[PDB]
Design a protein around this ligand. Structure first.
Ligand SMILES: Nc1nc(=O)c2c([nH]1)NCC(CNc1ccc(C(=O)N[C@@H](CCC(=O)O)C(=O)O)cc1)=N2
Ligand SMILES: Nc1nc(=O)c2c([nH]1)NCC(CNc1ccc(C(=O)N[C@@H](CCC(=O)O)C(=O)O)cc1)=N2
Ligand SMILES: Cc1cn([C@@H]2C[C@H](O)[C@@H](COP(=O)(O)O)O2)c(=O)[nH]c1=O
Ligand SMILES: Cc1cn([C@@H]2C[C@H](O)[C@@H](COP(=O)(O)O)O2)c(=O)[nH]c1=O
Lengths: 316, 316
């Protein structure tokens, strides 16, 4: 039933992959060369074998689609996924002169001053991100994130081109235009960067009413990693299919280094013994038909019963 | 045996694809979502069922790898594939004041002043591209082609970053670096363009000695189109595997709008009745170990016996 290419993609990786050592230095079992499909009329490819949370995919998303980059907002919509990049900023800070969080993620596991106290050096950084907007502005803002790669490309001439907005009007002016891609890989910015964009480029189609998507993820982690990467870019197919009064066909998923990080070997084994406890339905409000302003409760995902949720250590 | 994912990929397209009308306006039978692999120790995925010519893939290539864009050279190495873009320039020309080639490709089929006379308006353009270098310089130069996207990205600051050169030194400094891609999609240049780059981005790996490639072709034509697109980017895997003293594993091929243009329906049917008359061997000279200067005869492809060669009309 729907999420099964991810269940079928993890099975292949863990006996049959090749161990490959990553930077974090706790290897993998990987492939490279993988392509995966979902058909969104058989609903949402949201993972019933463990619990994936939707709220926090849905919040992430809109943030990107608003041409935003200020974590300030992720916090308001109760989100904190992108936190630690702005923190890596404030603890190496010019003006957080005092109680340092040096090496804090690969020393979460190790605790004792990072234990709570870094996680709450962090939340306190966070409130100034929420009240001294001088600190949202000048700290919660990661700059070159997907919302500035998809809606604010900085051009050879100082300003911005909005790229997911031409997906939306070209889907609409010439439909079955073979060129309908947005790249977020920006050559001249990958080296000074911390994570260049995992989700490099995604190609659109307008099939025949069916809006169909395909994402090119060069890096990919099966387990924590890929469950949120099926469900942000299938929600894009729904949103966009709806934006030009077209109707969802299918989301496809190209991979690079498809990987199941050696470290979380036995919790993936743990999932492939839960049987895909049916499929959710995303509905999105008929009355709002943009995609760019969507407050949170217009896109709603009906009927989820997941399995209980399976848990990781320290990501890096 | 080796080229069979292309033979298997065309069979699926022509009964089972969906007709989709392109700009040229002679539709298709297409898919979208396709991923294809080749393993280059079982030699070269060069097409024995019809005849593909190698010389002219090999010349094309080096041109791109020299950071070049002047058709002047393609001509010298007896190549004329990229011609008509510089001609579309010289017949709409400020200073080809007289004998016009208005609409010339979608009116090759139709002939009579384009018949020979445009093809030889063309070759004459060409000689000035070869002798009045003022005309190579200011006419044979397409500018933003793959050699300036792979080796000369124009940055938000006037100059160039050389991107296939960091594939070559990063493959080499940190090997199993998950980020090893070159994009040629340049957002802010796709609209003023004629063909934005079909071969958008390609990802590297360094498997374990095996250099492995994957190309992201958004558009793709099975028949004329895709045969040259298997064999330029597998030759890149050989060249690059050899450049950092690594050894070829495999080239993979991601597609977008995988297509068999309706127009050449019965010559593809014609191929899938030739049985894959074994496999060539590319050898490349031990003595040259760069990839950037390669004159033509260092990369040599041994033992080809193709089927006779099957032929198209007017591409556009
Ligand atoms: N290995 C890897 N996987 C990633 O998910 C990840 C990474 N590396 N480093 C950079 C990055 C940052 N994006 C992300 C992705 C997920 C979360 C997150 O909060 N959710 C995890 C939690 C699972 C658990 O710990 O129980 C997830 O499932 O994705 C945070 C930031 N993504
Ligand atoms: N449909 C399509 N296919 C393409 O090959 C093509 C296109 N469109 N338009 C832009 C473009 C330009 N690149 C190319 C590709 C191939 C040739 C070429 O000389 N070789 C063909 C010839 C086959 C025949 O006519 O008998 C080939 O097989 O690719 C020229 C320019 N590529
Ligand atoms: C932001 C992002 C990163 N990642 C990952 C997985 C990798 O193990 C981690 C570091 O990868 P990298 O070294 O290829 O950049 O980033 C995802 O899986 N999804 C995401 O959206
Ligand atoms: C330059 C290039 C174009 N093409 C194609 C196939 C398409 O039918 C033609 C026009 O496509 P487009 O409208 O998607 O740009 O360009 C290739 O197949 N290979 C190439 O390398």
């Amino acid at each position: 039933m729907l999420e099964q290419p991810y269940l079928d993609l993890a099975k292949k990786v863990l006996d049959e992959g090749h161990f490959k050592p990553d930077r974090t230095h706790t290897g993998t079992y990987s492939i490279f060369g993988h392509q995966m499909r979902f058909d969104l009329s058989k609903g949402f490819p949201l993972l019933t074998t463990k619990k994936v949370p939707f709220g926090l995919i849905k919040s992430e998303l809109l943030w990107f689609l608003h041409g935003d980059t200020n974590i300030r907002f992720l916090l308001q919509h109760r989100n904190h996924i992108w936190d630690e990049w702005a923190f890596e900023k404030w603890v190496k800070s010019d003006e957080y002169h005092g109680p340092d969080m040096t090496d804090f993620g690969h020393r979460s596991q190790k605790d004792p001053e990072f234990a709570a106290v870094y996680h709450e050096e962090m939340a306190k950084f966070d409130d100034r991100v929420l009240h001294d907007d001088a600190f949202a502005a000048k700290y919660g803002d990661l700059g070159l994130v997907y919302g500035s790669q998809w809606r604010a490309w900085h051009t050879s001439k100082g300003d911005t081109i909005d790229q997911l907005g031409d997906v939306i009007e070209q889907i609409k002016t010439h439909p079955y235009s073979r060129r309908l891609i947005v790249s977020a890989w920006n050559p001249e910015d990958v080296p000074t960067m911390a994570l260049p964009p995992c989700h490099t480029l995604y190609q659109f189609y307008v099939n025949d009413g069916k809006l169909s998507l395909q994402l090119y993820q060069r890096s990919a982690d099966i387990f924590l990693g890929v469950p949120f990467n099926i469900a942000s870019y299938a929600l894009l197919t729904h949103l966009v299919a709806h934006e030009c009064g077209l109707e969802v066909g299918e989301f496809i998923h190209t991979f690079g280094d498809a990987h199941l990080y050696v470290n979380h070997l036995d919790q993936i084994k743990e999932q492939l013994s839960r049987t895909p406890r049916p499929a959710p339905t995303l509905q999105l409000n008929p009355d709002k038909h943009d995609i760019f302003d969507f407050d949170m409760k217009d896109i709603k995902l009906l009927n989820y019963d997941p399995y209980p949720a399976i848990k990781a250590p320290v990501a890096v």
